């Protein structure tokens, strides 16, 4: 389907100005005008290249032997019978030249005649593409295409588009008046890098779809890197005292976020786990709870999934992960089995898939899962920090590559992510953007390195363009936007060397404001850019943990219903992500306040309804009773507590109340107003 001979069709007589590059499944190398430029639909020369497999005497003929020169394995057979053997592969090259064709397009067929005198256009089952790889195979050797990706040098430099016909793809020069209107993508790439983003798929494989279909759509652009990015998401945890007495475990939900520690030049995969601090009867310590004494040890189970937030799949090794307490006390090393993955882990996906159960760190009947053990002091430290860190390495295994011999994609034992990642990291600018549900998503984009001559052969990459191709920013009416939000609703942060670089650029441009000149800010290799929703406050991991009083209040303004049982509100998915809970209080006529859920571990009274609305439940820690308001003039005040003001342990002096918690008023109404 993606197999056959490769054709270059030129408007000039000497193979200088290619107009179309395309493959044909069979000896029919025609392109009718209906598939086409206009005054440039007159091709005066052409070149086809590929291999032929068969066992007989064969004579070659074309529909135009007078203009044709054809080579089989480097012997001229057209400018005459020749012997070919079954199960062997012969290179083919065909050149054609005609000086003022009066028809547009090309009618051209390649035939052969066997010994039984059967002449026919060569079958698709006999034709294969050239070996457009950085290396020859034992079978198919390779050889105006300096890097051998298949795209002519001049197209890569000057700009090209691919049109998806039904049968196959035409690659042609970009032209303003035809293609900008029709809204086509304008590609440039290096003519000397087989993969301009230094990744394992070629610029030509990308744009013609001869590529692993699990590769992210944006990474089908030759200027956007395709590579996995993997972290571990822990969903819940259960702690146990290490060894017929009763169950004495602590089970808690957990929230995990991939992190980034500034912008910074580290390529590590890490996630930070927050263990829920809310109520799980009594207010015992953890050791009291499990009956741990000072010489006991505890252990930990959890449910996890792997998360691929990059742009290429992983097939046959999940990366290895350290579970770390505090700054550097490794509690465990988590490995899955090499070459025994139950599924691939695709971009923007989980392993296991969400429709299947998660992985238990100590799985049911797995006899050799290592206990994740803590000594007593480590246990107390976990109680107090309620935090773990998962450090995941970048060992991702073998790559699924396109095979030009059979037009198939398969895991190639000879190709490995560890051979590609370093050069990807070396030749691209990195942007981390959180505009999608506030999680940190990293992309890398081909960008010039002025100090490295090869990298100066790549097209200029602007900040604006980068954001459009790597993250799907668009500009529907003069303004760059991500899914409806203007770019000005996000901040820019850079590492120190990038910051200096960008400051020099703006001064050169006499620009005072970065947002009005994104189209003129150039990106270089090794830059690091962090772009974050401005509504939010972020911690040192760049996770969203707060927001302005004004933003929080505004987001709660629209109230659907209120009563003595609770509140029913529409709250933005994003705001909800920065809140740990609510505090409900009745304020009497003299100003004194009765706090109803007055404990740091009893703030979890919001819940997401199946209809998307939020219910704030007054009954839950009021002993299942609606609020009792002894006087209609009393007020019911409700407060939001952001995660960065959340208290996660009793206070120093032992107080477990909400006293002193920094909280944001978001609802206040008298008894008679409810
Ligand atoms: Ca090329
Ligand atoms: Ca290239």
UniProtKB/Swiss-Prot annotation:
Effect seen on changing residue 140 to A: Reduced cleavage by FURIN and reduced toxin activity
Region spans: Alpha-clamp: 170-178
Biological processes, Gene Ontology terms: protein homooligomerization; symbiont-mediated suppression of host MAPK cascade
GO cellular component: extracellular region; host cell cytosol; host cell endosome membrane; host cell plasma membrane; membrane
PTM statement from Swiss-Prot or TrEMBL: Proteolytic activation by FURIN cleaves the protein in two parts, PA-20 and PA-63; the latter is the mature protein. The cleavage occurs at the cell surface and probably in the serum of infected animals as well; both native and cleaved PA are able to bind to the cell receptor. The release of PA-20 from the remaining receptor-bound PA-63 exposes the binding site for EF and LF, and promotes oligomerization and internalization of the protein.
Pfam families: Binary_toxB, Binary_toxB_2, Binary_toxB_3, PA14, PA_Ig-like
Record protein name field: Protective antigen
Species of the source: Bacillus anthracis
């Amino acid at each position: 389907s993606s197999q056959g001979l490769l054709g270059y069709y030129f408007s000039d007589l000497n193979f200088q100005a290619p107009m179309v590059v395309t493959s044909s499944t069979t000896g029919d190398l025609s392109i009718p005008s209906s598939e086409l430029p206009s005054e440039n639909q007159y091709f005066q020369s052409a070149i086809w290249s590929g291999f032929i497999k068969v066992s007989d005497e064969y004579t070659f003929a074309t529909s135009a032997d007078n203009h044709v020169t054809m080579w089989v394995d480097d012997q001229e057979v057209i400018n005459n019978k020749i012997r070919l053997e079954k199960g062997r592969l012969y290179q083919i090259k065909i050149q054609y030249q005609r000086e003022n064709p009066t028809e547009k397009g090309l009618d051209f067929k390649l035939y052969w005649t066997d010994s039984q005198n059967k002449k026919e256009v060569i079958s698709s089952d006999n034709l294969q593409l050239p070996e457009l790889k950085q290396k020859s195979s034992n079978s198919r050797k390779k050889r105006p295409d300096r890097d051998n990706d298949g795209i002519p040098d001049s197209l890569e430099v000057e700009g090209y588009t691919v049109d998806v016909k039904n049968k196959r793809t035409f690659l042609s020069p970009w032209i303003s008046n035809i293609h900008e209107k029709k809204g086509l993508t304008k590609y440039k790439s290096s003519p000397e890098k087989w993969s301009t983003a230094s990744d394992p798929y070629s610029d030509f494989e990308k744009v013609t779809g001869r590529i692993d279909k699990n590769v992210s759509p944006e990474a089908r652009h030759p200027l956007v890197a395709a590579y996995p990015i993997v972290h571990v998401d822990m969903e819940n945890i259960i702690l146990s005292k290490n060894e017929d007495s009763q169950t004495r475990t602590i089970s808690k939900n957990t929230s995990t976020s991939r992190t980034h520690t500034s912008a910074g030049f580290s390529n590590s995969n890490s996630s930070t786990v927050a263990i829920d601090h809310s109520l799980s009867a009594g207010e015992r310590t953890w050791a009291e709870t499990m009956g741990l004494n000072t010489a006991d040890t505890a252990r930990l189970n959890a449910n996890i999934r792997y998360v691929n937030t990059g742009t290429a799949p992983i097939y046959n090794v999940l990366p290895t992960t350290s579970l770390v307490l505090g700054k550097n006390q490794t509690l465990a090393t988590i490995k899955a089995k090499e070459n025994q993955l139950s599924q691939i882990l695709a971009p923007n996906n989980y392993y296991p898939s969400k429709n299947l159960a998660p992985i238990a760190l100590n799985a049911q009947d797995d006899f050799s899962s290592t206990p994740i053990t803590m000594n007593y002091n480590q246990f107390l430290e976990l109680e107090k920090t309620k935090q773990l860190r998962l450090d995941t390495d970048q060992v991702y295994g073998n790559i699924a590559t396109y095979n030009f011999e059979n037009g198939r994609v398969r895991v190639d034992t000879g190709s490995n992510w560890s051979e590609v990642l370093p050069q990807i990291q070396e030749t691209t600018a990195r942007i981390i953007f959180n505009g999608k549900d506030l999680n940190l998503v990293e992309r890398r984009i081909a960008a010039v390195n002025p100090s490295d001559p090869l990298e100066t052969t790549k097209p200029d990459m602007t900040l604006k363009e980068a954001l459009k191709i790597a993250f799907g920013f668009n500009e529907p009416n003069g303004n760059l936007q991500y899914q409806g939000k203007d770019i000005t609703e996000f901040d820019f942060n850079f590492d120190q060397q990038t910051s200096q670089n960008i400051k020099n650029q703006l001064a050169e441009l006499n620009a005072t404001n970065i947002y009005t000149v994104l189209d003129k800010i150039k990106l270089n290799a090794k830059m690091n850019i962090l772009i974050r929703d401005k509504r939010f406050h972020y911690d040192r991991n760049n996770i969203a943990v707060g927001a302005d009083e004004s933003v929080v209040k505004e987001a709660h303004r629209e109230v659907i219903n209120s009563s003595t049982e609770g509140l029913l509100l529409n709250i933005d998915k994003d705001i909800r992500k920065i809140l740990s809970g609510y505090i409900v209080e009745i304020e009497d006529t003299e100003g004194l306040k009765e706090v109803i859920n007055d404990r740091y571990d009893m703030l979890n009274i919001s819940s997401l309804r199946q209809d998307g609305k939020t219910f704030i439940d007054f009954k839950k820690y009021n002993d299942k009773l609606p609020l009792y308001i002894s006087n209609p003039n009393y007020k019911v005040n409700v407060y939001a507590v952001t995660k960065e003001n959340t208290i996660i342990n009793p206070s120093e002096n032992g107080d477990t109340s909400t006293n002193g918690i920094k909280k944001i008023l978001i609802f206040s109404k008298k008894g008679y107003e409810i």
